């Protein structure tokens, strides 16, 4: 007559959920097949004085239950002050650490801080290369992104991005257009090291929050150089190799980068009402510019479909939609043309913003989150990724964040994070008929979650191709 | 087609589980009827430099979903170094904080540090008074326990305990007997305050670990005054009012206190083969002594059955058993006689230690934990509380800690905590046929858990009468 929660877990499979907790200061791996946390780590134990555990991505492991590795980064300084929490810390740490952590079959082991190895500290999205030989991090306080070597944690290339607005006033700096510079960023210290750990490099004193594009324009974000901000978000990888795409929130574009040859090749134009691309101009061997006549909308989330045939960029706030390019020609990204826009009448207000996304392994469906400020219920939209139409929206709870998916394609596992002070949980949805099977405890503020992949192929639908 | 985890929750009822997470630095409330974490708090956010969030207990609320209060304490100093975690903070904050926290129906709000209010800091067990008008804390580094008023957070009474060994050598200091002093503490600062926060008063640098009785005898616990140690653990409450019982680990006795009159009245002797009690001697209006000819075994967990008819004290390590007194005479604890001992062939070695307990509402059964060091399976023993025998033992996983029960008596809800570095979980067992229904994710190193009570009556089986 009693129900055994074990019966629930039995159907999910031998998959390991990993998620960091933002203001909780912790990261945890969970065994979906038993309901046990496998191990957890509190960064404060390692002298971290502002352990805002932000983004993460895990390398493929042949058996996650015996061992896996992952990267998780952190944020600090004034980012401690921007949620509902009445924080009382004098002199927070600066964050921007890039921690390397290994689960050994029993515990998590801190291996090192890659920001100290490389010299470069970055605080927003973390992705793995499709070869699983490296990883990338973006940051929108410094506006730098880089790909790092897995074995030595040294920077393979870093790029730095700057805004030169047509109108020198915060309110019009983006709307009235400008020129973005893409700059090769090279080390300064012995050892080929950067001098950019912690708050070194910050043009603004915290990451822009959702809608925070309005706050910066209204002069309400402090920083040394807000007029120069582009708010880089992510550096996402083409599952086919060669290309990395850096997303830029404030000017509403993506830059496609040639990873091995270390040049940008194409600028994708996000908003409805813009061409497929803007023109990339080379200024010298290390400097490119791109001219943006006006910014119609900021964008945010960016990602490839697991076969690399589609590239997506979400417009956010001013427009709320999913922009889709035909990325089928792997040879030449200057040829990638817009082929669809996903819209809904639901999406006409400032909110919801269409954010984190995961594809099914066959690329036929996507799960994309719908984020709102308190107190509107946040949730998940099911998208037909062949016709480019919304199939359904399901309502979940406050502050929906990331989605991941079991590699068999059967279950979408996401996190809700309570705006750091309220309801938080793991959500499980089956993808056969798109029903929510329900919620597991998760006393954490997650802005990321992955399922540990086993193979290079699994990476195509983990934290590699999308955020 | 699919199993919905919701169906598991449906059967549990509208109950709220709260637990702190020791090295996770966090405390979290969880809704058993949905699987959601309702709210969590990270003490680092408040500039707590050693948030070892240790014990806790919750006041009754008419509707815990709309609001409840709770007390959670912390530890610090060298307690940070006692797990397998390679902690890197060499000089941690002192801990001993006594946090008052209110869940307000949406978030957890830190209300104050009662140790700063009162001036007294204590790091081990926290219990609620049976009137819910106050709480108590004990501490085995400074050997002080106290009952505090709920409204002002000021000390009603505090008692300090001190050991004077027959033989002045740590190996023999307890086995060859001695005199324990029970001393009334008075405030020494302006404003009714004590001067006992943080490390002030410590005789030893960390709380004795399970087995730690041997380590202190072997000279291996550093400290100003280890020959004077008694390792106070708790102050538990008679559900009938009037009496409080302080447990002393090293000399293996419990002291019964008259709460309203602020005198000790009786000393109960723990080990199998000692009398019911030892003789309390009054020295002056603030000083009592008790002479202990030899200490046969240290003890640990102490608690009353919910009707107050039985009082239990566990012997641990040298003997492993449950000592039981007849406490039916509410008017005179000098009359309380040993009436039974629960033993098992199961309990043969040094380990398991039987460490935490919860009763059924009708007092007919008790659930008690079985703790071992890694890696032996830890678990739960079901005790017939009428005939005083072990009914059943179930194996669960690593590092079993506390037990609570839903107030309808239907489900035992415990925590397992991975020795701070490995697997951790919430466990649910039904009490009708004593089967483990399964586990829930819990990325915390819990040393305590409660279900938020609704009435004074519920308190008799919560963190008030037992630990
Ligand atoms: Cu992002
Ligand atoms: Cu974030
Ligand atoms: Cu105890
Ligand atoms: Cu403890």
d(CA B74, CA B43): 10
| Coil, strand or helix at B323 | strand
Which contiguous run of DSSP H or E holds residue B12?
Answer: helix B5-12
The answer for residues whose C-beta is within 8 angstroms of residue B418's C-beta and 6 or more apart is A37, A39, A40, A107, B398, B399, B424, B445
What is the CB neighbour count within 10 angstroms for residue A132?
Answer: 18
Distance from CA of A136 to the nearest CA of B (A): 27
Give the 3-state DSSP-derived string for B174-220, with helices as H, strands as E and coil as C.
CCCCEEEEEEECCCCCHHHCCCECCCCCCCCCCCCCCCHHHHHHCCC
Closest CA to A330 of A246, A237, A459: A237
The response to whether B356 counts as a known ligand-binding position is yes
- Experimental method for this entry? X-ray
What is the CB neighbour count within 10 angstroms for residue A329?
Answer: 12
Distance from CA of B148 to the nearest CA of A (A): 26
d(CA A412, CA B200): 52
Residue A426 near residue A392, CB atoms below 8 Å? no
What does the DSSP 8-state code read for residue A322? E
What does the DSSP 8-state code read for residue A221? S
The response to whether B446 counts as a known ligand-binding position is no
User: What's the distance, Cα to Cα, between the start and end of chain A in Å?
Assistant: 42
Chain B residues within an 8 Å CB radius of A51: 44
Distance from CA of B37 to the nearest CA of A (A): 5
A45·B89 Cβ contact <8 A: yes
Residue of chain A nearest B416, judged by CA positions: A36
The response to whether B7 counts as a known ligand-binding position is yes
Distance A398 CA to ligand 2 centre (A): 15
Residue A65 near residue A105, CB atoms below 8 Å? yes
Place of tokens 């954010």: A355
CA A250, distance to chain mean position in Å, is 15
d(CA A360, CA A412): 9
* Residue B142 φ/ψ, nearest 5 degrees: -105, -5
The neighbourhood of ligand 3, an ion, using CB within 5 A, equals B 233
- Show the tokens assigned to B400: 């079993």
A421·B39 Cβ contact <8 A: yes
d(CA A111, CA A406): 27
A441·B30 Cβ contact <8 A: yes
The response to whether B331 counts as a known ligand-binding position is yes
d(CA A308, CA A295): 27
Annotated binding-site members of A for Cu(2+): 7, 22, 54-55, 90, 112, 125, 153, 207, 228, 233, 300, 316, 330-331, 356, 399, 401, 447
d(CA B210, CA B216): 11
Annotated binding-site members of A: 7, 22, 54-55, 90, 112, 125, 153, 207, 228, 233, 300, 316, 330-331, 356, 399, 401, 447
Q: Are strands A280-284 and B287-292 parallel, antiparallel or unpaired?
A: unpaired
**CB nearest to A35's CB, from B25, B435, B439:** B439
Distance B25 CA to ligand 4 centre (A): 13
Distance from CA of B455 to the nearest CA of A (A): 25
Distance A128 CA to ligand 1 centre (A): 15
d(CA B71, CA B175): 36
| Coil, strand or helix at A44 | helix
A40·B85 Cβ contact <8 A: no
């Amino acid at each position: 007559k009693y129900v055994k929660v074990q019966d629930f877990y039995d159907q999910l499979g031998k998959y390991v959920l990993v998620a960091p907790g933002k203001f909780s200061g912790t990261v945890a791996a969970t065994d979906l097949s038993t309901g046990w946390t496998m191990a957890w780590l509190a960064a404060w134990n390692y002298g971290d004085t502002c352990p805002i555990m932000h983004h993460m991505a895990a390398f493929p492991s042949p058996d996650p239950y015996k061992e896996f590795e992952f990267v998780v980064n952190t944020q600090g300084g004034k980012n401690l002050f921007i949620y509902g929490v009445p924080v009382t810390v004098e002199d927070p740490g600066e964050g921007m650490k890039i921690y390397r952590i290994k689960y050994d079959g029993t515990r998590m082991n801190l291996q090192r801080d890659a920001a100290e190895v490389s010299g470069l500290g970055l605080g927003v999205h973390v992705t793995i290369t499709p070869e699983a030989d490296g990883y990338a991090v973006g940051d929108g306080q410094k506006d730098i992104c880089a790909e790092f070597d897995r074995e030595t944690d040294m920077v393979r290339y870093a790029w730095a991005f700057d805004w030169d607005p047509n109108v020198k006033d915060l309110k019009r700096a983006w709307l009235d257009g400008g020129t973005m510079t893409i700059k090769r960023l090279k080390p300064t210290l012995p050892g080929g090291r950067y001098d950019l750990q912690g708050s070194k490099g910050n043009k603004i004193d915290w990451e822009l929050v959702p809608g925070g594009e309005l706050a910066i324009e209204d002069g309400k974000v402090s920083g040394d150089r807000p007029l120069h901000s582009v708010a880089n978000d992510a550096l996402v990888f083409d599952p086919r190799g060669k290309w990395a795409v850096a997303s830029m929130r404030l000017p509403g574009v993506c830059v496609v980068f040639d990873r091995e040859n270390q040049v940008p090749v194409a600028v994708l134009a996000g908003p409805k009402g813009t061409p497929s691309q803007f023109q990339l101009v080379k200024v010298d061997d290390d400097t490119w510019t791109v001219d943006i006549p006006e910014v119609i909308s900021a964008g945010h989330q960016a990602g490839f479909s697991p076969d690399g045939q589609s590239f997506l960029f979400m417009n956010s706030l001013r427009q709320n939609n999913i922009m889709v390019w035909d990325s089928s020609n792997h040879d030449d990204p200057t040829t990638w043309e817009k082929k669809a826009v996903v819209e809904s009448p639901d999406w006409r207000g400032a909110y919801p913003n269409t954010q984190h996304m995961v594809f099914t392994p066959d690329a036929k469906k996507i799960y994309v989150t719908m984020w709102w400020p308190s107190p509107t219920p946040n949730g998940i939209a099911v998208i037909d990724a062949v016709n480019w139409e919304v199939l359904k929206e399901v309502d979940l709870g406050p502050d929906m964040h990331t989605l991941a998916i079991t590699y068999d394609g059967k279950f979408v596992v996401g996190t809700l994070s309570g705006y750091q002070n309220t309801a938080s949980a793991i959500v499980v949805m089956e993808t056969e008929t798109d029903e929510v099977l329900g919620f597991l405890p998760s006393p954490m503020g997650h802005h990321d979650n992955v399922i540990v992949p086993r193979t290079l192929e699994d990476l195509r639908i983990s934290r590699s191709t999308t955020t």
